[PDB]
């Protein structure tokens, strides 16, 4: 959209309603007259607009009111409340802005943030921005977490986040105005090469792609119009559903063939009875003819019974002959009807091998976008984030995605090589126990008013526990953690010395021989200016390729590449790198997915903060001490950098409301 409504759309907000959050902070306004709601709403959208139109500088309340017009700039307390809500929840003055009003002289409260992933960095920046003592503990020797950018010389390649999934309503938009990111569109055209090295014929590419999409729609229909979500006391997965849909297609094909060939026997048997009829009739005609000849034999003059005999036999023969001729007409019609049915036979099969294999490559593409075997996805809920997808073409970052975490980390107290071992949270504060990763004998103890936990769901999932909670997380949280899905996906960076591929093609596929190996090195990317190809491993194949040496793997790569480009045109990679994300102990996988048996409701559980019981008994309820952010915690934007970012902004807001108080709610 465009205008202030543009701002609201870009702020992932409904420009014409107050949200649940807004209701919460302004219950006076939403339970009031629609007029003031419209005022409110304009004030909101306009302030949003102002921030958005220039996000490289802090948007002060004074500046905001300065550019507000009457009647809207009459109620200055409404304006202030609004602006404050916006600043707090990170709808404005978030990311990297030049601060007008330099930071608060003395800080209030203490927050310890586990992990300097993108969500970590975000919250930290906001909390600091709000005048709080924030320190982050990071197990790695770098920022970014699952934003991981390879560099050597001029070779630059992400093994982590790679894509901005569209700028329409994306916070990364604001970021890219604040940071120098070389954003580059992705040309979504992708040729497929059969295991041999021959491109799949456009005809095929299309019949298959289309059939894929129809199968998906099919499953959705089974899901939502048919409540096929639960099968045998066990939840159905997208993958199962798919296989059932397919089996029915093959069933239907055999059914068609059976109906057709039965029409052929029905008709063939008609012909049989007609033919019988005609033979017996011919025999009668032979006999009768003989008789008529024998009657004309008798020479005149003959009496009248004799004459009657000839006449009558003649009448009879002409009769039977007529009848035979009609039958023969009928025989003609049946024979040509049989040539028609023998001419229009239904389709021989549902899918050939080349067919099911190309189809397998489309399935592998799916397994890749979800980082998991389709057998694990919830039939009913795997697609549930789809309603909030951004608008506009997906994009890559040419200078690497690392620049963003780095950018965020400026001004922040970050402790690297600090692996948190245990978290202790009590009615009166918290202590985090960590170690030096280099020398895990050295110990650190950090005391704070609250902990922000942005540990990856893979880490949180670990058994036995990499991080210990004292007291333990409540059953409702741990069960949510078990229920979710933390998936896996890997990359192979190939650095050559000269481009030997089609430079107008950003990306191209390779089709796997088996269903099982459908995810092994299925796709390739040239997105970098420099010559660099990226080979993707997903699906069941993801996990398995991690137990194979780097060398063997780059081997299978150059193999595929030679098959497609010829042995004399592919050279040894100057430099090679291979991710192993499930193996990484700080990640323990790539990103969350709606496991079958899970729901997006679990993501919401993940984000619920924990409140320690009282120290003294019969003492009042205490303030929450443990908070959660990261990608696994955001219902509408899971498994994305912008999702991490948003969850960070969220928790920082909540934390600040907690310990600093929310002045904007009266």
């Amino acid at each position: 959209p465009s205008g202030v409504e543009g701002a609201a759309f870009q702020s992932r907000l409904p420009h014409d309603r107050m949200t649940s959050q807004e209701a919460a902070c302004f219950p006076d306004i939403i339970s009031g007259p629609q007029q003031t709601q419209k005022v409110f709403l304009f004030i909101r959208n306009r302030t949003l607009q102002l921030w958005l139109d220039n996000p490289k500088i802090q948007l002060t309340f004074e500046a905001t009111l300065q550019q507000l017009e009457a009647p809207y700039n009459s109620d200055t307390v409404l304006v202030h409340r609004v602006h404050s809500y916006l600043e707090r929840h990170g709808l404005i003055n978030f990311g990297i802005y030049k601060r007008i009003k330099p930071l608060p002289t003395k800080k209030t409260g203490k927050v310890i943030i586990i992990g300097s992933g993108v969500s970590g960095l975000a919250a930290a920046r906001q909390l600091q921005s709000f005048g709080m003592d924030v320190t982050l503990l990071e197990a790695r020797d770098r920022v970014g977490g699952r934003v991981a950018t390879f560099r050597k010389g001029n070779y630059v390649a992400d093994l982590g986040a790679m894509v901005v999934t569209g700028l329409g309503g994306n916070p990364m938009a604001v970021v890219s105005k604040q940071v120098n990111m070389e954003l580059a569109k992705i040309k979504q055209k992708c040729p497929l090469y059969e295991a041999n090295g021959q491109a799949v014929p456009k005809e095929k590419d299309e019949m298959v792609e289309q059939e894929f999409n129809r199968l998906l729609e099919a499953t959705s229909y089974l899901s939502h119009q048919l409540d096929f979500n639960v099968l045998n006391n066990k939840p159905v997965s997208l993958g199962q559903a798919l296989e059932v849909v397919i089996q029915l297609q093959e069933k239907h094909v055999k059914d068609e063939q059976i109906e057709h060939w039965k029409k052929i026997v029905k008709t063939q048997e008609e012909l049989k009875e007609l033919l019988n009829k005609m033979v017996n009739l011919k025999e009668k005609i032979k006999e009768l003819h003989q008789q008529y000849k024998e009657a004309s034999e008798v020479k005149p003059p003959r009496d009248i019974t004799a004459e009657f005999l000839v006449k009558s036999k003649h009448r009879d023969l002409t009769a039977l002959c007529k009848e035979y001729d009609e039958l023969a007409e009928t025989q003609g019609k049946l024979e040509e009807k049989l040539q028609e049915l023998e001419a229009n036979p239904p389709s021989d099969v549902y899918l050939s091998s080349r067919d099911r294999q190309i189809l397998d490559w489309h399935f592998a593409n799916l397994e890749f976008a979800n980082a998991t075997p389709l057998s694990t996805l919830s039939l009913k809920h795997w697609d549930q984030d789809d309603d909030f997808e951004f608008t506009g073409s997906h994009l890559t970052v040419r200078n690497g995605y690392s620049c963003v975490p780095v950018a965020l980390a400026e001004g922040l107290d970050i402790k690297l090589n600090t692996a948190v071992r245990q978290v202790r949270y009590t009615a009166s504060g918290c202590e985090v126990i960590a170690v030096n990763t280099r020398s895990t004998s050295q110990t650190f103890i950090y005391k704070c008013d609250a902990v922000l936990c942005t540990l990856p769901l893979g880490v949180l999932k670990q058994q036995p526990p990499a991080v210990q909670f004292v007291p333990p997380l409540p059953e409702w949280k741990t069960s949510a953690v078990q229920r979710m899905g933390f998936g896996n996906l890997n990359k192979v960076v190939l650095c050559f010395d000269r481009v030997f591929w089609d430079p107008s093609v950003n990306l191209f596929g390779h089709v796997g021989s088996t269903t099982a190996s459908r995810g092994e090195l299925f796709l390739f990317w040239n997105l970098y200016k420099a010559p660099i190809l990226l080979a993707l491993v997903a699906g069941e194949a993801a996990g398995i390729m991690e137990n194979i040496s780097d060398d063997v793997i780059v081997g299978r790569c150059l193999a595929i590449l030679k098959g497609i480009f010829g042995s004399s045109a592919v050279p040894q990679p100057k430099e090679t790198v291979v991710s192993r994300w499930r193996a990484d102990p700080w990640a323990r996988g790539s990103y969350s997915y709606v496991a079958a048996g899970s729901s997006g409701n679990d993501y919401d559980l993940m984000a619920q903060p924990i409140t320690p019981g009282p120290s003294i008994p019969g003492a009042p309820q205490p303030i929450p001490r443990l908070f959660f952010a990261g990608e696994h915690t955001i219902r509408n934007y899971p498994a994305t950098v912008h999702g991490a970012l948003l969850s960070g902004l969220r928790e920082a807001g909540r934390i600040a409301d907690q310990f600093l108080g929310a002045m904007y709610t009266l």
């Binding site: 894509v163 569209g166 799916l366 697609d383 789809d386 073409s393």
Partner: peptide
């Protein structure tokens, strides 16, 4: 006119 969006689960 590409099939799936590009990086969405859709």
């Amino acid at each position: 006119x590409x099939x799936x969006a590009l990086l969405a689960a859709x």
